[PDB]
Design a protein around this nucleic acid. Sequence first.
DNA 1: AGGCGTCG
DNA 2: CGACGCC
Length: 325
Amino acid sequence: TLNGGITDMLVELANFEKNVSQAIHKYNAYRKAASVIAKYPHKIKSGAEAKKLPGVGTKIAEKIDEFLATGKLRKLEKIRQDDTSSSINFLTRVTGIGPSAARKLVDEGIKTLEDLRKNEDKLNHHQRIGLKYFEDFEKRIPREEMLQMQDIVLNEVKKLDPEYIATVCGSFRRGAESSGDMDVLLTHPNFTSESSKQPKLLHRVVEQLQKVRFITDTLSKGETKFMGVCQLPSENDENEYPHRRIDIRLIPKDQYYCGVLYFTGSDIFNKNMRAHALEKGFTINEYTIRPLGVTGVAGEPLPVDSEQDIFDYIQWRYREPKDRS
DNA sequence: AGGCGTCG
DNA sequence: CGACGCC
Ligand SMILES: Cc1cn([C@H]2C[C@H](O)[C@@H](COP(=O)(O)OP(=O)(O)CP(=O)(O)O)O2)c(=O)[nH]c1=O
Ligand SMILES: [Cr+3]
């Protein structure tokens, strides 16, 4: 990295403006600038040089100026010392606990994991499971464990019904050496635009994975989406593998491509691509890609027979899953 | 960007 | 329903 310290600084300032202050704009800004700066070809030597960059104005230039001057930033240093801040920020690491919740738990004297482990009566189910697996939900999933996971999901999926098409998208499809959470797309001939929404098509799969005791817990659970916890079998006389996070989405059969596009790419990549959609008078959704009208309102979706087709609609160059970050 | 599912 | 927290 060339300006690592300034990007690192601005991002730390970003989390703080979200998790602690909940000033979305002051978080988006430190975010926008951090990227505009990671791109910048030369080493930044001053605040004004950097202010010429779009996405960085006077309050960010000032902090850059102080960071170059002194090898640090006071505001960052104080923030790191403030107990209520490091507390609030840390509770966010628990899945289920976001900005507001972390704040109340801190406001009420709950700050640590153990404190939380002594006050489960305040957490909801999701926050509780998160608290239950705070250490395991941290560890990254190697590329091989994801394969073994995919093996169990894929196998059992057909065992129930052969007409099921499962695709472990997310970071895995992109070719990552490790993964945060196993994202699996699912589709079936009974689910279509013309259908009337089948809640059993996903439930059937979950109960089957639960029966085999792969999916242990259940965070979210609905018709299309399922957020939960899964786990690989403990081969006799070996330490059981960590409990991972697993999302399962049920995309209509005739809208599959919108599904894999969305579920694969990248959060940021989707942000950029979907933004470019409106740029071309289109609206990319994970079910359909319908063009924005001659004034705003989007009409009927444009048929798609490949991710490729989607990239073509927005006059954009196709990005093979691996270059979506 | 854009949406699903939960809590009260 | 709106806010949340998440993907
Ligand atoms: C986090 C996030 C994700 N996605 C999309 C792109 C993601 O690949 C997919 C689900 O995200 P997730 O499985 O949490 O991340 P991953 O990209 O699969 C990276 P990791 O392996 O850390 O989960 O939906 C979004 O559209 N918006 C978001 O805010
Ligand atoms: Cr993932």
